[PDB]
Amino acid sequence: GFEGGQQPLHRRLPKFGFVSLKAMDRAEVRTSELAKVEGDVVSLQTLKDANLINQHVQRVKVMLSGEVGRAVTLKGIAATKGARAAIEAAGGKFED
Amino acid sequence: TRNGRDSESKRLGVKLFGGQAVKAGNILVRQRGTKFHAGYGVGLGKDHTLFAKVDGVVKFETKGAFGRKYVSIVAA
Amino acid sequence: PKMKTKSGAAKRFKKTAGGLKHKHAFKSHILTKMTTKRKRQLRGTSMLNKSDVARVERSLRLR
Amino acid sequence: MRELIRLVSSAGTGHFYTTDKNKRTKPEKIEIKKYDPVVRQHVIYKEAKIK
RNA sequence: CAUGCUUGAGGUUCUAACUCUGGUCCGUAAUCCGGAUCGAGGACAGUGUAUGGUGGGCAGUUUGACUGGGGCGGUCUCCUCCUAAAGAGUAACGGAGGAGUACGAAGGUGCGCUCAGACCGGUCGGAAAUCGGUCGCAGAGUAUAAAGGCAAAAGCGCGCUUGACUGCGAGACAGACACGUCGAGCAGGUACGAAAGUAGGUCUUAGUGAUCCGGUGGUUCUGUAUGGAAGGGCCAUCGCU
């Protein structure tokens, strides 16, 4: 960071933003990783029985990336608009 | 001594010469006052800057009364 | 041991998939005499200049 | 010199413009009509204090 | 207005707290130290803690650079001309000058008009005031230095007026970075004009200061069990010869 004595960048530009503590217990799951849980059920504990998410994650959102391997039911986890529609394409339901 | 002062150069002059292809918004001449006047297809900035308004080729014609020097844009 | 990230650099530069973001200087005070065009164009965020990348990634302990 | 002043909109919004004036020469309060972005109309603005 | 209940301030006195580097008794064989008893002072002094003043007695430090050696003197940021060799840029303690502002109209628009000066005639004013005529074409003018511009006058006058607008922005000029400069066009609302249209400050180039921190006006953000708040974030803005 030295510059010869001239004012350095990390003191010439302003600070901005704040760190979110709400996002520290959040995770996202691709639609391609849905067919790795044990059986036909995607939950918070089942995504942790497999190594898809860390043990401290409390909120999961599913987003569209790839294709869903089989028909899974999603329990207690959110999904996007495209992520949802592709799930019922492969006979998978979406309750709670 | 009571003299050691000056000012930073302003980089004035012609930026595109006769025959060069131009685009809209391209700066043609930087001036103090108007050595050159805006011809066809050229506009005048508030500090007397000539900029292209259409696509084409620089012309650099002098014509009309008053012996003015005009910068115009023509077909390519 | 573990490299220690510079605290002041991390508050001014945020790492994204495009590069490193930052805000613009000359917007804290003395804003009346400025032109609204000047103030409107210093408002967003921009990526680090190509010649500033090396000195900042070394300050953030990214290289 | 030219003291700094403030123009505040006559709508309920807190939107304000800023400029300066010569208070010795002009004891009048500036009463100008300007554009308010929040309500998207031209309304009246009134001089106030910058502080 | 005496009263009854409290407290603030002062003075006077008393002894019982504390003080005695005062006497005599004991421990004891002892000008220490304790205990007892007389004597004096006495809620004072003195010590702890909180606080204002004084305090080189003592301490940790600072006290710029350029520079035909250092000191003394001068300079340190910005604008105009020359040096600068007909693109841009180009140094010297090289040669000359300016700035650290002004303007709510000195801005926008529509309409209208040409200056300085010379001569001749005319009541006092007389080389020079206001008026008439002829010539003149810019030798005038431009808020402010100099250079470059100025008839669609960019100069002058009047009516209406707030575009000295909000979100942007194709494309460029400059440039180590941070900063800088020009801008057609699109969307919202406007002002002049019958209308084509013009208007995102002033003929242009100087009139300036990063970050941190703190203050004010807004806010579909966050807010340490939860509902709020405090605090933080985003936009606007104020405070550094």
Next chain:
RNA sequence: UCGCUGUGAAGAUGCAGUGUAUCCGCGGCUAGACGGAAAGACCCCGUGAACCUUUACUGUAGCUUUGCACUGGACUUUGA
């Protein structure tokens, strides 16, 4: 391990040109070897060091002011 005149990081035993001169000691004198000694003390520089000064800055020992505590009784003047 010569002199001179030039050249040359600018005052040459060692370079150019030239002139002199068999090889080696001893006793004496100090003109040169920018001779020996001491990483110049003069001058400048280093965002070096010490010690000294004061109305430089920031503190401090000591001295002093007042609130509370150790700390009580009575009377009296005045205030709410």
Next chain:
RNA sequence: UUAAAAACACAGCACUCUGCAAACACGAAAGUGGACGUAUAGGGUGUGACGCCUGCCCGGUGCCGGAAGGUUAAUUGAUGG
């Protein structure tokens, strides 16, 4: 251990502080010196036998005195939001 002097001391002079558990000095303190002294005494400061003398200024900065008024700390907490 490159300076023996015109430098220091001195007897004499003056100012100033100190009433005794003295001022003052060394000690985080107890204590000790001053002094087993008591204003003809003790400390500090300047001048420097002797003779003739030592003139004007209190505006600056010190010290001494005064208490009326103006400011002024911890502390207290009326009022308002």
Next chain:
RNA sequence: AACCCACUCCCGUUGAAAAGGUAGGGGAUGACUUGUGGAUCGGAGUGAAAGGCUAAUCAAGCUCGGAGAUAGCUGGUUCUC
């Protein structure tokens, strides 16, 4: 004269000697000289005051630790193509 000191010249300067010697010199009953034992010391002591002395060391002793302090400054940096 002894004793204490150190004013001048010369020698010596790799010295006989890390401060002397030969010639002269000052005080020599006093604020004198000296033996033995004791007290005061490192931001401290002591000083008839030269910033002098505190073990050949003094504008802050020596010794061991922090400590391989820091050195934008000199010096050095080893086989071949």
Next chain:
RNA sequence: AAUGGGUCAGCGACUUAUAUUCAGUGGCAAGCUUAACCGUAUAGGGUAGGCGUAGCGAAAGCGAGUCUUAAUAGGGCGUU
């Protein structure tokens, strides 16, 4: 005629630990790899954790998009 070296022999100066980035060379591959620890103790277990498969925004959040904005306008960053 600026420094250093009287000579010989021996010694004498780019190291190590932990975190990382780039290149070469290998193991697996939308997955790769374990740390403390257990253990027959270089095997084997242990996948807590780290990196990658998705970005935009200060954030709530939305997500092949997102942010700015009155704006499915423009523009910034991202996507085969």
